[PDB]
Amino acid sequence: MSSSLEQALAVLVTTFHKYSSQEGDKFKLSKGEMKELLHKELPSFVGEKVDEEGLKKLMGSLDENSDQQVDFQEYAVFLALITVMSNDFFQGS
Amino acid sequence: SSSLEQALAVLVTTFHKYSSQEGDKFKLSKGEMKELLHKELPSFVGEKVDEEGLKKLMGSLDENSDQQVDFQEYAVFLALITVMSNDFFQGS
Numbered sequence: 001m002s003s004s005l006e007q008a009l010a011v012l013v014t015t016f017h018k019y020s021s022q023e024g025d026k027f028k029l030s031k032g033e034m035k036e037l038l039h040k041e042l043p044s045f046v047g048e049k050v051d052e053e054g055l056k057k058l059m060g061s062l063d064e065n066s067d068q069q070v071d072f073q074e075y076a077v078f079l080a081l082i083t084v085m086s087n088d089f090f091q092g093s
Numbered sequence: 094s095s096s097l098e099q100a101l102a103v104l105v106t107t108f109h110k111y112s113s114q115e116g117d118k119f120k121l122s123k124g125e126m127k128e129l130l131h132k133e134l135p136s137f138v139g140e141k142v143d144e145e146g147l148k149k150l151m152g153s154l155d156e157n158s159d160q161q162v163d164f165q166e167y168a169v170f171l172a173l174i175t176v177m178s179n180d181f182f183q184g185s
């Protein structure tokens with residue numbers, strides 16, 4: 001049976017495809033699509049238990065480059081960055 | 094439970110499960126990463142690995158086992174392993 005981390009990675013893949021399937025190459029999504037994804041699929045990037053500033057700016061940079069295509073590995077980079085900016089494990093220092 | 098938030102939460106706990114065991118709780122060595130992959134991805138990864146890219150990736154962790162990686166690096170590695178092993182990318 002599937003391990004907890006296998007299941008988590010599976011969900012990273014299906015969430016990616018939920019968006020990547022919508023235009024063009026199914027193995028890509030645009031930075032604009034990724035911004036949509038982060039809005040819709042994750043909790044709020046506002047408040048004192050997250051790096052609100054870092055998250056604001058990360059999201060704004062996705063705007064600046066909305067047409068640029070992102071692969072799965074890059075998507076995971078962005079997810080990892082947001083996770084570090086939002087998860088108490090990291091923000092508690 | 095199927096949300097992205099919960100999946101990322103598991104990425105973080107699985108990271109710390111291993112990073113907590115020695116030194117900085119925000120790093121794990123490449124040798125421990127290899128261990129984590131064998132233990133925590135038993136079906137997608139070895140024990141033993143049939144794919145070329147995965148074989149190389151695992152050998153490199155061994156060669157470089159004392160180098161330390163942070164969560165972002167661990168996440169990237171996991172992503173690369175996923176692209177190398179998941180039917181979505183592989184059956185394309």
Ligand code: NA
Pocket residue numbers: 019020021022023024025026027028029030
């Ligand atoms: Na696409």
Ligand code: NA
Pocket residue numbers: 038039040041042043044045
């Ligand atoms: Na959100």
Ligand code: NA
Pocket residue numbers: 111112113114115116117118119120121122
């Ligand atoms: Na450590």
